[PDB]
Design a protein around this nucleic acid. Structure first.
Ligand code: MG
Ligand code: MG
Ligand code: MG
Ligand code: MG
Ligand code: MG
Ligand code: MG
Ligand code: MG
Ligand code: MG
Ligand code: MG
Ligand code: MG
Ligand code: MG
Ligand code: MG
Lengths: 58, 206, 67, 58, 143, 145, 70, 141, 62
RNA sequence: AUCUCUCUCUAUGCUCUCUCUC
RNA sequence: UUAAUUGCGAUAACGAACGAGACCUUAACCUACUAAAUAGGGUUGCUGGCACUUGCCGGUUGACUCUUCUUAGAGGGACUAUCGGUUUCAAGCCGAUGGAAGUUUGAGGCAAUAACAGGUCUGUGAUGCCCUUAGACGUUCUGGGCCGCACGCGCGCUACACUGACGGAGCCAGCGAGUACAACCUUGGCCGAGAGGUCUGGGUAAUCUUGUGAAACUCCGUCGUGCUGGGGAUAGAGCAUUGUAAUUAUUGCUCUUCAACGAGGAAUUCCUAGUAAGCGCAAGUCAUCAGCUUGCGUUGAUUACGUCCCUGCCCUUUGUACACACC
């Protein structure tokens, strides 16, 4: 995620650019697994920063 | 000569002794006659390149520029002035056409003719703005071989360019003609004339 | 351009001082030794150190060396 | 949110920044340091750092 | 031993196909043949009056044979090019949108190009056969 | 492609629609010299006439020329709709016209006069001698009259 | 060029008798040696190449490379 | 099924992928023969490895190249590289070490990539200039 | 008149602008002469250098 | 005892000023 | 010596600390490992076509098998390695071999001390102080205006044509970006000759748009030394689109109108390899508009590898009637 911005807050000066970037990591997993127990498993253990998303379909 | 049996269609020429002898897109890379003593590894020849279009590193060392095929260098030089920066394919095509023209007119292997032209255009004595206070004083300086060759090539290309600037004559034909003139016969080509003038200037100065 | 840092040189010197048993001429073995013995934060630096150690060793096996 | 993952992450970042700003503004005497945002699917946890804890509590 | 469309040279093949089309009676021409510039990104209409639309049709057929799921829009994108805005640097503008559609319709009428239930147009078996025949003819012409 | 050498039949430099039509320009591009006539539309006219474009300016027989003229002056009857001709819709008749040679300029003049009469911005600009269609005269138009 | 875009009979005859002896035949060449200047020269060249007369070397358009039979 | 070797070819960003099998004598670019590629002039560039090695070394081969990226010239180069690489891979797998050496020797009388993948990759375009190294245009006064 | 001499050693590079090389030229026709010559452009050891000038020589370039 | 040997015009310019606590 | 207060070394200095370097970020190399209908293959089914005796080219979410390409993750890789000579043989350097690569491997990103009376209160709820504070310099609505034009500079674009232009027809890219508590990127099928409409669905993301079938280029033509089909400014007239609102053409598209402009004075910028230039594209702005920037990627040269002559800079010495410091 690149945001190209002039570093100068006024514009008076030389043409200086900074591309403030945020590299975002996805990484997915596919589980062919049972029900309630699986659901229980796919909820626990949380590290600060990473977001876990579990979808649906039976 | 010796047809190789494949499921895919291959032309007859390819099948023939072009597999055996690897010289050009159907031209002699042999003969090998440089009129001046040695001059090799400054005018390349030898390595029998098929088509004058190789992507390599020829600026990343001092003299490595020499190991460019002369035809390729010519093509590169042709690739000049706004409308034609990049588009090396065009240059290659033009070179091919030039070669064909040479073959047609006064026969011979065109490569040799090209070599001759390169030899006989380029200058022995050159001028540098040495200064003497920044003023109009130019000491006569003799030229190094590779540089001289390059200069000759450039002037040849320049001649062609000059010819083509609003004319019926397509670049290639004109180039061929001027090359022929440079080699030997008339010496009424632009590039050669320029070179001679430069030499004269150098002579009248020190 | 390849004239190396002071720190790297110092490290090499230290290694020579303290680990002349071990370290030879084989750059890959030397590298491994450096990785083991010296605790360095980056690979490039380690490599450089190893190289300089090798150089020092070469110098040694041609007569006694200053410093 | 239902919005794109990347966008969601950006929004979260912005929210974090906002929170930090708020804390800087409000918790002057309370002796504020730093914030963390931990997100569990049901509960959103914010861990605030300070020196005068009683004041922060109330 | 045999022939297919990919293995025979582009332009020659196309011209042969055009010739074949001309020879054939069925084509269903528009009421605006060589009245349109074939592209809004183009300055001047095609030359040599008769045909050219035939050629375009042939080209379209070839493209369809090559791929699988090609619609009108994609075809339009394929054709055209840089529009001389004059003083302003030339942006890529697509071809005339209706002409391609018309061509496709014509092909359908002839029975060479059909539709797939995913979106776009695909080749018909008869069309494939025709293409193969044309390829064979081209080969014969060569040697 | 034509192998025909042609004898003394074609007469170069023709006086067609008052304005002089020059020699050996390619029919369409020979017609372009006339005002109101322009490239693509000339080509279209030629096509309508059913004369081959790959011919000389002097080559054209009189009948063909006449036909071309007819096509030009009366355009609507020969399948030429709106996205085609000069004064589409028009302000004076409601019918569209493909104005030519010494007509378009006259029309323009008339329009200018009307603008002047009714003191509109464009008209005012024209009267002055200034640039109309969205231009900054900070740099634009230093050639003058 | 002062016009000279005519496939004149005399001109054609001249072309027929001047294209031999000279090894190279092109539009540019024709223009140079004063006969036809421009577009119809190409046409003439094409219609000289039906069977024999001048043999082709070029497998390329825009620039023509042609040699008379020896 | 007969064992077959997969290879690739790189230039700029253009990616060729060759599949060398045992068969009759196939040499294919996407779905077409090498007798086409595209630019007609550069047909010899892709044909060159074959010319070097010997066309008989193909009497038992099947070659198919899937090419994506670059432009045209780059694509051609990549294809050529893949073909060379394919041949060498085949030799490594099925033939003999001396043969491989010979092949290498034949190639390295040129070394237009062929067996070794090219370096020289696009440099990023910096701010304050239209090009990577090219600065803008200094106005002064 | 035509003469040619092989280069063997470079005596540095001199010039107000620079670039122009001072070379030691040895004649392949009689190796008894090693002269100080002005050469414009890229030049190494063991190169045949054609000379339109026969005898005139200069060192420093100013 | 080893140097070697370089070169010329170019005039002027008016808008301040600053310390601590031991 | 080195790009370097980078080293080696001589040593009233010794031991340091920033800075540089290292370091990160990517770009290259990994037929090595982990892996993959959101990435491609491989064989075979299921079929389609032509050869027909095996076959070639495909289509299809059929299985199953992997992972070289595409993605990443851990890692590895080069350290100047190996010689060859040169140099108080130390520091290093140039050439050759091997290597994906030997310019610090290319480019970045962070950038010291000290400042400038540089820039901005027109980024701010970052504010001191002075002012105006109710017919208000606050505030919003309506309409202009910043876009005016005798002129003078600064960027940039298009051209001055055959390597062209104009037609066809070949055909190939990488960064992106894109839907919710709103009106996005838009495919596919019919309208229109363009622009753009229109019913539908896909896609709030490696899946759909999009393989962004992008140009420039490539081949067959047509034109052919002509201010001419080069150039498309300026003008008309008309059809849509965005918007409550297009006149002072918003833009777009069709038309006609065809000027200056024959490669550019003195001057001066930019550049030493995937670089220069040509060529596009996407993004930023954005309701609508790119000639703009910012990032990609195609096409790919020529000439250096050096000197201090001009223009600066660095230290050392030197001379200063100069510290507002040669302005
Ligand atoms: Mg050594
Ligand atoms: Mg760095
Ligand atoms: Mg204020
Ligand atoms: Mg008031
Ligand atoms: Mg403004
Ligand atoms: Mg600027
Ligand atoms: Mg035009
Ligand atoms: Mg143009
Ligand atoms: Mg892609
Ligand atoms: Mg004109
Ligand atoms: Mg606006
Ligand atoms: Mg003074």
């Amino acid at each position: 995620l690149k945001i190209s911005t002039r570093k100068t807050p006024n514009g008076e000066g030389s043409k200086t650019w900074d591309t403030y970037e945020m590299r975002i990591h996805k990484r997915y997993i596919d589980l062919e697994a049972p029900a309630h127990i699986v659901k229980r498993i796919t909820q626990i253990t949380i590290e600060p920063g990473v977001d876990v998303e579990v979808i649906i379909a039976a | 000569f010796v047809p190789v049996e494949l499921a895919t269609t291959i032309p007859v020429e390819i099948q023939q002794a072009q597999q055996e002898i690897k010289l050009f897109n159907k031209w002699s890379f042999e003969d090998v006659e440089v009129k001046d003593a040695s001059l090799v590894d400054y005018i390349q020849i030898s390595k029998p390149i098929y088509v004058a279009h190789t992507a390599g590193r020829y600026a990343n060392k001092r003299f490595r520029k020499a190991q460019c095929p002369i035809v390729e260098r010519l093509t590169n030089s042709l690739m000049m002035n706004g409308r034609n920066n990049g588009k090396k394919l065009k240059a290659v095509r033009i070179v091919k056409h030039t070669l064909e023209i040479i073959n047609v007119l006064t026969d011979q292997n065109p490569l040799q003719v090209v070599v001759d032209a390169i030899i006989n255009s380029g200058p022995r004595e050159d001028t540098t703005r040495v200064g003497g206070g920044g003023a109009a004083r130019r000491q006569a300086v003799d030229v190094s071989p590779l540089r001289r060759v390059n200069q000759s090539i450039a002037l040849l290309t320049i001649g062609a360019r000059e010819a083509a600037f609003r004319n019926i004559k397509t670049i290639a034909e004109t180039l061929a003609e001027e090359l022929i003139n440079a080699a030997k016969g008339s010496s009424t080509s632009y590039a050669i004339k320029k070179k001679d003038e430069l030499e004269r200037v150098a002579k009248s100065n020190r | 351009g390849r004239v190396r840092t002071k720190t790297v040189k110092r490290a090499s010197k230290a290694l020579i001082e303290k680990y002349y048993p071990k370290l030879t001429m084989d750059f890959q073995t030397n590298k491994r030794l450096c990785d083991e013995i010296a605790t360095i934060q980056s690979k490039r630096l380690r490599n450089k150190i190893a190289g300089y150690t090798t150089h020092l060793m070469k110098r040694i096996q041609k007569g006694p060396v200053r410093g | 949110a239902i919005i794109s993952k990347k966008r969601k992450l950006v929004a979260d970042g912005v929210f974090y920044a906002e929170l930090n700003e708020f804390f800087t503004r409000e918790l002057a005497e309370e002796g504020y340091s730093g914030v963390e945002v931990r997100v569990t699917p049901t509960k959103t946890e914010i861990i605030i750092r300070a020196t005068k804890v009683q004041d922060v509590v109330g | 031993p045999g022939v297919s469309v990919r293995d025979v040279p582009a332009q020659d093949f196309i011209n042969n196909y055009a010739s074949f089309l001309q020879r054939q009676g069925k084509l269903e021409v528009p009421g605006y043949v060589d009245i349109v510039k074939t592209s809004a990104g183009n300055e001047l209409p095609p030359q040599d009056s008769e045909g050219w639309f035939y050629k375009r049709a042939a080209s379209v057929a070839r493209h369809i044979y090559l791929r699988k799921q090609v619609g009108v829009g994609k075809l339009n994108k394929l054709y055209g090019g840089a529009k001389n805005r004059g003083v302003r640097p030339h942006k890529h503008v697509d071809a005339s949108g209706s002409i391609n559609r018309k061509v496709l319709q014509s092909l359908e009428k002839l029975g060479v190009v059909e539709i797939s239930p995913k979106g776009g147009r695909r080749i018909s078996d008869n069309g494939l056969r025709d293409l193969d025949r044309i390829a064979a003819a081209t080969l014969e012409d060569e040697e | 492609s034509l192998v025909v050498q042609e004898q003394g039949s074609f007469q170069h430099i023709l006086r067609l629609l008052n304005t002089n039509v020059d020699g050996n320009i390619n029919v369409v591009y020979a017609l372009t010299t006339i005002r109101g006539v322009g490239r693509r539309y000339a080509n279209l006219v030629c096509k309508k006439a059913d004369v081959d474009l790959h011919k000389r300016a002097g080559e054209l027989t009189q009948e063909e020329l006449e036909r071309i003229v007819q096509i030009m002056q009366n355009p609507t009857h020969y399948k030429i709709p709106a996205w085609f001709l000069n004064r589409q819709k028009d302000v004076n008749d409601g019918k569209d016209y493909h104005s030519l040679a010494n007509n378009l300029e006259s029309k323009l003049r008339d329009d200018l006069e009307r603008l002047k009469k009714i003191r509109s911005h464009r008209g005012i600009r024209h009267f002055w001698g200034l640039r109309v269609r969205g231009q900054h005269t900070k740099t634009t138009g230093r050639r003058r009259a | 060029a002062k016009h000279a875009v005519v496939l004149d009979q005399d001109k054609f005859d001249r072309i027929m008798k001047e294209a031999p002896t000279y090894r190279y035949v092109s539009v540019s060449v024709l223009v140079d040696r004063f006969k036809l200047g421009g577009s119809l020269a190409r046409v003439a060249l094409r219609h000289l190449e039906n069977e024999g007369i001048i043999k082709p070397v070029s497998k390329h358009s825009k620039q023509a490379i042609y040699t008379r039979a020896t | 099924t007969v064992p077959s070797v997969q290879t690739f070819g790189k230039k700029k960003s253009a990616t060729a992928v060759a599949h060398v099998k045992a068969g009759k004598g196939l040499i294919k670019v996407n779905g077409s023969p090498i007798t086409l590629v595209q630019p007609e002039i550069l047909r010899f560039k892709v044909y060159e490895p074959l010319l070097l090695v010997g066309l008989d070394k193909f009497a038992n081969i099947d070659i198919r190249v899937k090419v994506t990226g670059g432009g045209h010239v780059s694509q051609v180069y990549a294809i050529r590289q893949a073909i060379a690489k394919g041949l060498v891979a085949y030799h490594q797998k099925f033939v003999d070490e001396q043969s491989k050496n010979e092949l290498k020797k034949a190639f390295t009388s040129y070394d237009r990539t062929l067996l070794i993948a090219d370096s020289r990759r696009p440099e990023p375009k910096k701010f304050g200039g239209r090009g990577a190294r090219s600065r803008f245009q200094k106005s002064y006064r | 008149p035509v003469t040619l001499a092989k280069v063997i050693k470079v005596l540095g590079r001199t010039g107000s602008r620079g670039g122009v090389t001072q070379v030691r030229v040895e004649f392949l026709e009689d190796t008894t002469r090693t002269i100080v010559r002005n050469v414009k452009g890229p030049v190494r050891e063991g190169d045949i250098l054609v000379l339109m000038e026969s005898e005139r020589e200069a060192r420093r370039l100013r």
